[PDB]
Amino acid sequence: KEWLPVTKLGRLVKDMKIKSLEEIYLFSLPIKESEIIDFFLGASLKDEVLKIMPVQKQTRAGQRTRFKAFVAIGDYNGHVGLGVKCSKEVATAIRGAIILAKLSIVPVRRGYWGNKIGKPHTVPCKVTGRCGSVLVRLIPAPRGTGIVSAPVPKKLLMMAGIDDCYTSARGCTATLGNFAKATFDAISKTYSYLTPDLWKETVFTKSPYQEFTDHLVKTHT
Amino acid sequence: MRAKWRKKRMRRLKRKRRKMRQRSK
Amino acid sequence: EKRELVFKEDGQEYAQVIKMLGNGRLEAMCFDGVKRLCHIRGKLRKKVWINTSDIILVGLRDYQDNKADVILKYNADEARSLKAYGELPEHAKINETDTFG
Amino acid sequence: HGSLARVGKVRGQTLKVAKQEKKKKRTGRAKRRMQYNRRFVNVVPTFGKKKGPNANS
Amino acid sequence: GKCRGLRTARKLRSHRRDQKWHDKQYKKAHLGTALKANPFGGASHAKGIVLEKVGVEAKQPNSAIRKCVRVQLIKNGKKITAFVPNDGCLNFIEENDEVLVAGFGRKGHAVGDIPGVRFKVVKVANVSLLALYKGKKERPR
RNA sequence: CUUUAAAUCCUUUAACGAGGAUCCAUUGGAGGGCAAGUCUGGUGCCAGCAGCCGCGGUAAUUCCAGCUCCAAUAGCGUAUA
RNA sequence: CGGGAAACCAAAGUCUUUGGGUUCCGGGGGGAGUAUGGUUGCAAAGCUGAAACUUAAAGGAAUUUGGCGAAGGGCACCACC
């Protein structure tokens, strides 16, 4: 029942030393357990399955069908993720899809439109993503417009906490996995676009590896 | 049926009908 | 198993094929001296074959006298027993499937 | 059998059952509210694909 | 475009006109032959006279006898077959009467497993076929 | 009573006037797109449904009838521009 | 580096973060490079070039068993020496 970790990040988040996962996103440390997310995010992390499809390799004994399951994850205050797991039984494929979506959640920032009043509601710039042959655009919107898109990026943008935007899609958007990954790597690009208010020189604080290393090396071997 | 002999048959049919039209007048 | 010899109805008059054409179409010279292009049913597509010079229980159309529909195909012994009954006349052409006509 | 050219045979030889009593209307203020609260509050679907309101099983 | 001059308008307009002429849906609506060859002559519905009842077969694997009606038009005078829609409704139509025909739903193309038809039957003998099938009305003698 | 060339339409006001308030709300659908039944009985690649995939083979979530249910609801469905 | 559906590409790159300039050319697959009209040519034949009708597929890249009158190996006294 009780969790015992593998890496050092498990000790760092269980010894009441990592206050928030924004430090992990700042230092871009890789994550390899679906349970630091359980520690930092509570019941706000919903799970809704997108699509179940069969994939078939076929041999002399006929086709054997493993099942591919897309799921999209994310709390409604920021972070949103996606994960694809394919196996034979439906339930373990669904559970592995939840786990792999739970690892790869990306933080997002939200901007304004026209005037910078109140809490942010839309994406700050025009960002896109590239995978396969599909295009997903994220155009900022005036307040109260809502998300206008296909139902799958409607689900993704409502789950991510985006109140409103404008989209446009090009290409063979019938393949839902490629289209969902295009939306995922489009919304993950809302950081990687330098804006003039981020122009000042950053300061580097102490890394969490340097923060408690003497306690870390004595609390695990 | 490849395109070479299909073109040859259409050419022969066109030549035959053109000869029949020019000798019919 | 020896099935029961079903009889004709008003629209199931006895007929015999004289020549089979292509395109999945069958043509039979009926016993009333009429010719019908007789269409093969879904059950009779690949499970059984209508060979030539055999009697065919055709299905007539009540609104046109051009096409027929098939009801059932008969084997040789049931055809000979129906011949011995006398429902169909003496000018039938089985003749141990002769090709002369 | 008669022929294969008969029309309306399934319409012809089928059974006949008369109609029943008369239902109540109030222009959708409870006809759809009943199925809404059954779908959203009363009937709780188990984790899976879907669940319908006309499940006669 | 790829011809991108500031004083290039007539070349772009002529190229757009030619490449729009190289089409199918625009060429159907902006040519006289595509409407002249239409049996209705550009009309929605048309009336006709029944001359012969023809029964046609079906296409590949799905095989059934579909029953249609050969109609001669009033405004034009060409024999055009028409498919009676519902179950057992061929008993209503007799020969040498009046029938109202209309399209079946793909803008002038064969639909489903019936080979070589385009048009269905809506009204026969100046009464609706739906009321004849349902039982709300009855064919006058 | 009023309006109006004179009325009818509407507004106003007497006497009547709802408990299956019979003073009776229809149109297309129920496999996927596309909200809504492995319901029952009948013919069982026939009859038919189906704008597209496809359902019809005597275990029909699609045909033909009865029950329930969803959609807009005095409106709804179909065809041609 | 980057791009593409992928084979692949220092160009097939600098493309939703689209805009250096400028000719020809394609809108599902058949019908069909066919008929007619013009034009060129001794002849053969080149150039321009449809429609009616029909169909829900025709096509491009690539992974697993399949099958070779393709090649390369391994094993067996129910194959051989």
UniProtKB/Swiss-Prot annotation, chain B:
It holds the Pfam family Ribosomal_L41. One of its GO terms (cellular component) is cytoplasm. The keyword Ribosomal protein applies. Residues 1-25 are annotated as: Disordered. One of its GO terms (biological process) is translation. Coiled coil: none annotated. One of its GO terms (molecular function) is structural constituent of ribosome. Its main location: cytoplasm. Keywords: Cytoplasm, Ribonucleoprotein, Ribosomal protein. It is found in: Cytoplasm. The keyword Ribosomal protein applies. Belongs to the eukaryotic ribosomal protein eS32 family. Component of the small ribosomal subunit. The ribosome is a large ribonucleoprotein complex responsible for the synthesis of proteins in the cell. Interacts with the beta subunit of protein kinase CKII and stimulates phosphorylation of DNA topoisomerase II alpha by CKII. Component of the small ribosomal subunit. This is Small ribosomal subunit protein eS32.
From Swiss-Prot, chain C:
It is found in: Cytoplasm. GO terms for cellular component: cytoplasm; cytosol; eukaryotic 43S preinitiation complex; eukaryotic 48S preinitiation complex; multi-eIF complex; synapse. Keywords: Cytoplasm, Host-virus interaction, Initiation factor, Protein biosynthesis, RNA-binding, tRNA-binding. Residues 1-75 form the S1-like domain. Component of the 43S pre-initiation complex (43S PIC), which binds to the mRNA cap-proximal region, scans mRNA 5'-untranslated region, and locates the initiation codon. This protein enhances formation of the cap-proximal complex. Together with EIF1, facilitates scanning, start codon recognition, promotion of the assembly of 48S complex at the initiation codon (43S PIC becomes 48S PIC after the start codon is reached), and dissociation of aberrant complexes. One of its GO terms (molecular function) is tRNA binding. GO terms for biological process: ribosome assembly; translational initiation. Belongs to the eIF-1A family. It comes from the Eukaryota. It comes from Homo sapiens. The chain holds residues 22 to 122 of 144 of the full protein. This is Eukaryotic translation initiation factor 1A, X-chromosomal. Its main location: cytoplasm.
From Swiss-Prot, chain D:
It comes from the Eukaryota. It is found in: Cytoplasm; Nucleus. The modification N6-succinyllysine is found at residue 49. Component of the 40S subunit of the ribosome. Contributes to the assembly and function of 40S ribosomal subunits. Component of the 40S subunit of the ribosome. This is Small ribosomal subunit protein eS30. It comes from Oryctolagus cuniculus. The chain holds residues 77 to 133 of 133 of the full protein.
UniProtKB/Swiss-Prot annotation, chain E:
Component of the 40S small ribosomal subunit. Part of the small subunit (SSU) processome, composed of more than 70 proteins and the RNA chaperone small nucleolar RNA (snoRNA) U3. Gene3D superfamilies: Nucleic acid-binding proteins. The modification 3-hydroxyproline is found at residue 61. Its main location: cytoplasm. The modification N6-succinyllysine is found at residue 53. The keyword Cytoplasm applies. Component of the ribosome, a large ribonucleoprotein complex responsible for the synthesis of proteins in the cell. The small ribosomal subunit (SSU) binds messenger RNAs (mRNAs) and translates the encoded message by selecting cognate aminoacyl-transfer RNA (tRNA) molecules. The large subunit (LSU) contains the ribosomal catalytic site termed the peptidyl transferase center (PTC), which catalyzes the formation of peptide bonds, thereby polymerizing the amino acids delivered by tRNAs into a polypeptide chain. This is Small ribosomal subunit protein uS12. Residues 1-25 are annotated as: Disordered. The keyword Cell membrane does not apply. SUPFAM superfamilies: Nucleic acid-binding proteins. One of its GO terms (biological process) is translation. GO terms for molecular function: structural constituent of ribosome. PANTHER family: 30S RIBOSOMAL PROTEIN S12 FAMILY MEMBER. Hydroxylation at Pro-61 affects translation termination efficiency. Transmembrane segments: none annotated. NCBIfam families: PRK04211.1 (NF003254), uS12_E_A (TIGR00982). GO terms for cellular component: cytosolic ribosome; nucleolus; rough endoplasmic reticulum; small ribosomal subunit. Belongs to the universal ribosomal protein uS12 family. There is a cross-link at residue 36 (Glycyl lysine isopeptide (Lys-Gly) (interchain with G-Cter in SUMO2)). Residues 1-19 have a biased composition (Basic residues). It comes from the Eukaryota. It is found in: Cytoplasm, Cytosol; Cytoplasm; Rough endoplasmic reticulum; Nucleus, Nucleolus. The modification N6-acetyllysine is found at residue 134.
